Amino acid sequence: LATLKVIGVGGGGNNAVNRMIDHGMNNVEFIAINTDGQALNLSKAESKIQIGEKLTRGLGAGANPEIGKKAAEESREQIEDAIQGADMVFVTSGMGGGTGTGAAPVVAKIAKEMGALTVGVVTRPFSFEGRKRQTQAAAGVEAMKAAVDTLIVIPNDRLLDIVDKSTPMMEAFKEADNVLRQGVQGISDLIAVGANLDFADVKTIMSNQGSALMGIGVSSGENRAVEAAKKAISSPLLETSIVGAQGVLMNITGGESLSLFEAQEAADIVQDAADEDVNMIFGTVINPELQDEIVVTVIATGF
């Protein structure tokens, strides 16, 4: 099999990883990296790494990406042990901050150099979070694009239609914790439990590609495979049409009622909606706790 590890860098990344653990995510190994020691105490993650004990004194990075970066460099040795043995690494974070913006490109570089498959699933701050935060976000993404094989970036501003009414500012990122889960889980489930899936294909589809898009669709009808896939390619999470992708990774997740016929019939929707020369690979994941629900996750990389 393959050894998959999910690393959360920063408070936001660590909070998303907490949600992943809480949601019942499995097949994967969680790691929590923060400069803030006291917030790292709140991590459900099995392995915890506090970085920049000297630089920060466990106080935090003060939303300074320069501090977060040196913190990771200072503890580069400790990061390497965590990543050791990993076939795939996920770097989960939120950009615009200090620990996430600065240190996550370091963890991503350390992982990719060690021969792991590095995908980073990160977010972009809300428009209201600041002007500095958006500024350090963009620079953080660019430092992430270079450091990783494939990068999925989800602007929080697109999650603004699905945010729960009367929610406070402190709970504003609950949907970010979900969408970060959907991206990490959509891939993790497909490798570890997927049916038509072999790792070298993922490696090919996702290595040194750069930017990617994520679409999730859910349906429970007679033609749920078609419906969920059509929802997936028409998802509000993709910035643009999937047609520009020269690779597509598709996860069809369903219960025991999910057939070979259903899987391909769903995959036909995703392949018309993309260029005719795409390398598309899909697989089936079985969660027996699903009776009539089916979830389709597509990752469109290549542009």
Ligand SMILES: Nc1nc2c(ncn2[C@@H]2O[C@H](COP(=O)(O)OP(=O)(O)O)[C@@H](O)[C@H]2O)c(=O)[nH]1
């Ligand atoms: N997914 C998620 N993102 C968050 C959360 N809190 C903050 N963020 C995002 O992460 C950025 C702040 O980074 P944060 O982890 O809080 O501080 P850092 O340690 O300096 O990286 C903000 O721009 C937010 O958009 C959270 O609970 N979950």
